[PDB]
Structure 1
Amino acid sequence: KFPRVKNWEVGSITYDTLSAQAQQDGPCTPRRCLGSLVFPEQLLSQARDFINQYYSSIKRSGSQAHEQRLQEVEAEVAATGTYQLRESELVFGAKQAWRNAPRCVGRIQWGKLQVFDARDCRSAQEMFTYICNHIKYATNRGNLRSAITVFPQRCPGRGDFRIWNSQLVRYAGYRQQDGSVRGDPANVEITELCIQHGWTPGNGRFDVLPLLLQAPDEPPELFLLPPELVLEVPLEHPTLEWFAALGLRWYALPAVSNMLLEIGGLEFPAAPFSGWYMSTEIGTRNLCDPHRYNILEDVAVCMDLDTRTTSSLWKDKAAVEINVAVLHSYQLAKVTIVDHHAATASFMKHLENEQKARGGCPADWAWIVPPISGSLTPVFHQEMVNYFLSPAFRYQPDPW
């Protein structure tokens, strides 16, 4: 009926009544759980539900304006096979999509999202202008502001606007001869696509990639981000003097650009969004994942730890100092950053706010709990319920 969830640190229980409202199917069945896996009339039912959500949000549900809107969309769909959202609806929908993202621990900030309407975009060049503007606004010289820029919706019998890059700012990954990768291993494919489309590659570990922007029915076009718009942070450790010499750095702006935004049945294949970094994403995942920069052993060796035996907990010790270096460096550079303890505590507050506001909150435990020191944070001890609500952000296949 209603999932009963317990917080094991306090013993409190709540019921996630919002889950009974889940609009789409997940991959689990009563026979087996797949929670750990990373990956016309229908349009109308989704559109109506969304319009209903919008009017409820402004406390005008059941009004003649609400009825008029419903009829307006039904008419548009009959006449064109699709419909258009009003600016206020787009803004509400984009905020709801963030609010609804089960894997995001930074949702306490959902209501403060700044939504840029780029549905008037006509070309790859105009896209670029929007992207540079988003980066300038969002970065704000270190005092980051959450934002999303929404490009034109998917339309039948017309290609999509697409940003080939996974994030607005990413480091190149160069296949070396010996099979190794110089730079970020996660970006080998996009790096090679950029080279193929005319980019002259660098040869460093932290070379900022160019953007491959695609306008409807046009091949992707290459654009170089002005270095003055890309704020970066050189990494140093507060006590380990040699850390700075490793030459490690990371960018200030985490801007996912390959996800699809769905609002009332409409799809926006290009709608880059950005907030600010939770330190573990950089320190633990980006820098320490075995398939990423994999710097753990290199750092442990510099700290002079016994890397001969697992029981010395050399990996754990190195990891903690790498995260300390990240936090210390961003704070020194005056660039917004949140540590995993502060972030998880704010998420517990978000859960409480949502229990009061909607009677629940879709949350994916495996993604909410940080990659290091999980049980040292409050979210680890909190049972969660994962489900799909729309508006939403969804994964989509790469354009190539």
Structure 2
Amino acid sequence: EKEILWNEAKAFIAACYQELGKAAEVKDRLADIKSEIDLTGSYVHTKEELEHGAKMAWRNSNRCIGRLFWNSLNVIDRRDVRTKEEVRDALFHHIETATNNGKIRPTITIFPPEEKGEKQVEIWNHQLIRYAGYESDGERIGDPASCSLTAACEELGWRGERTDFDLLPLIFRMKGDEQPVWYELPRSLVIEVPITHPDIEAFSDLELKWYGVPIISDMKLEVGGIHYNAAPFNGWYMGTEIGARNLADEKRYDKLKKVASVIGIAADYNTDLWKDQALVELNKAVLHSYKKQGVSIVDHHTAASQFKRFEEQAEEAGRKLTGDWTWLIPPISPAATHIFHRSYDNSIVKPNYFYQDKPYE
């Protein structure tokens, strides 16, 4: 266990300090760490290490098209929190600062890491801002992806209004508590964007909306053998995540048939490509709506052009590029991007963000 930790620490510190121009400081820092492990079973990252590790982890995320901006990640160090009111307030603050009145700042808030594999803080939310979903007899309301978390919140005394867009409460558990606690999101903190279309007036009849900032809160950040299981982060949306998946997937909001109706085309024949046409108009609407409201968003073409620059930058820096082609291609017109036409090495490099088991389900 100390072995695993010490090895990961050596590899991380060497790489981190080398990138920071601090290679001469490695030996002594490794000494102090070597001693810290032996005596304590673990080690504490300096603020520099933690900030740079979170950035490296984003840089190494094979499935992320948005990596060009890895080095400008805003890292908030909240390893000092000890109470659920502090965790709540840190989560609220992250929402406010990341949102930044619509000019989204990619941000991560880092909570105390696991100790003996024992979590200090365990966040139940998949994103800090997400819509509830309900499925009783016949009745399908809200986001189906949220059905199991929604049902767990309602087990704890929360009750949703059962609109298609109920905001789930924040829900997390403190070490030593048997049950999580939940806190309703202050609506003043949550920017939402009504979906309208630039040319088609009737599009507002769909009464679609989405929230401004995706803040993924259920992954584990690993840096130098330290497991930060609670470390929510956000970028800005790529439009297709909303228009081609959240609002379009049959198992999510399933809106293509309704889009086809409001844009005035038939939804009767596959050869009419009505789904494709509906997708393009819905995705135009999403980009238009976010831009009109002054909320950051990127389209999949601009995003892919940025990712090409990330590839070029990787090569120029002497770093291997890794990537997961199946996740990097956009779900709309993928062959119109350069990503589609090359292959990527899907190797896992640490620091990195990882999946971890849900505590509901």
TM range (shorter): over 0.9
Q: Say whether 1:59 aligns with 2:18.
A: no
Alignment of 1:9-158 (within 5 A): 40-61=2-23, 63=24, 65-156=25-116, 158=118
| 2:289 is aligned with 1:342 | no
How far apart are 1:200 and its partner, in Å? 1.9
Cα distance in 1 between the residues matched to 2:56 and 2:20: 14
Q: Aligned with 1:95: secondary structure?
A: helix
Alignment of 1:236-255 (within 5 A): 236-255=196-215
Q: What amino acid is aligned across from residue 151 of structure 2 in structure 1?
A: E
Residue correspondence of structure 1 range 166-185 to structure 2 within 5 A: 166-178=126-138, 180-185=139-144
C-alpha separation in 1, matches of 2:278 and 2:36: 59
Aligned mates of 1:124, 1:321 — CA distance in 2: 44
Q: Give the superposition deviation at 1:217.
A: 2.1
| d(CA) in 1 for partners of 2:20, 2:167 | 43
Question: Match of 2:71, as an amino acid?
Answer: G
Aligned twin of 1:360: 320
Q: Which runs of 4+ in 1 moved over 3 A?
A: 157-160
Please give the alpha-carbon distance, in whole angstroms, between the structure 2 residues aligned to 1:161 and 1:399: 12
- Aligned equivalent of 2:172, options 208, 213, 226: 213
Match of 1:201 among 160, 174, 179: 160
For residues 159 and 230 of structure 1, the distance between their equivalents in structure 2, rounded to whole angstroms, comes to 28
Q: How many angstroms apart in 2 are the aligned matches of 1:336 and 1:157?
A: 37
Q: Distance in 1 between matches of 2:190 and 2:117?
A: 36
The C-alpha deviation readout for 1:200-254, integer Å capped at 9, x for no partner, is 2111001111011211121211111100000000011111111112110000011
User: Counterpart in 1 of 2:145?
Assistant: 186
Kindly report the root-mean-square deviation, in angstroms, between the aligned alpha carbons of the 2 structures: 1.1
Question: Counterpart of 1:33?
Answer: none
Shift of 1:126: 0.6
CA distance, structure 1, for counterparts of residue 205 and residue 27 of structure 2 = 65
Aligned to 1:399: 359
Do the aligned residues in 1 keep the contact of 2:239 with 2:300 (CA within 8 Å)? yes
TM alignment of 1:289-328, pairs within 5 A: 289-328=249-288
**TM-score normalised by L of structure 1:** 0.88
Contact 2:202–2:263 (CA under 8 A) maintained in structure 1? no
Q: Distance in 2 between matches of 1:261 and 1:290?
A: 31
What's the counterpart of residue 388 of structure 1? Answer: 348
Shift of residue 304, structure 1, vs aligned partner: 3.1
How far residue 339 of structure 1 moved from its aligned partner, in angstroms, is 0.4
Deviation at 1:375, TM superposition (A): 0.4
Counterpart Cα distance in 2 of 1:387 and 1:210: 36
- Name the SS for the 2:189 alignment partner: coil
1:155-188 deviation digits (Å, cap 9, x = unpaired): 117443111000010001011321x420000000
- CA shift for structure 1 position 386: 1.1
How many residue pairs get aligned? The number is: 358
| C-alpha distance in structure 1 between counterparts of 2:146 and 2:209, whole Å | 16
Distance 1:84 1:280 in 2: 39
> Gaps spanning 5+ residues in structure 2: where?
none
Structure 2: distance between partners of 1:335 and 1:189: 30
Higher relative contact order (CA 8 A, sep 6+): 1
Within the candidate set 246, 261, 270, 2:221 is matched to 261
Shift of 1:42: 1.3
The secondary structure found in structure 2 opposite 1:390 is coil
Structure 1: 5+ residue runs without aligned partners? 1-39
Higher helix share: 2
Cα distance in 2, alignment partners of residues 170 and 116 from structure 1: 22
Tell me the distance in 1 between the aligned counterparts of 2:78 and 2:323: 30
Q: Please name the residue that 1:8 is paired with.
A: none
SS in 2 for 1:82: coil
Change (3 A) 1:351 1:43: same
Partner of 1:15: none
On the 8 A contact 1:164/1:212 being kept in 2, the answer is: yes
AA aligned opposite 2:260: A
The 3-state SS of whatever aligns with 1:288 is: coil
Q: Match of 1:162, SS?
A: strand
Say yes or no: does 1:333 pair with 2:293: yes
Distance of 2:247 and 2:270 partners within structure 1: 20
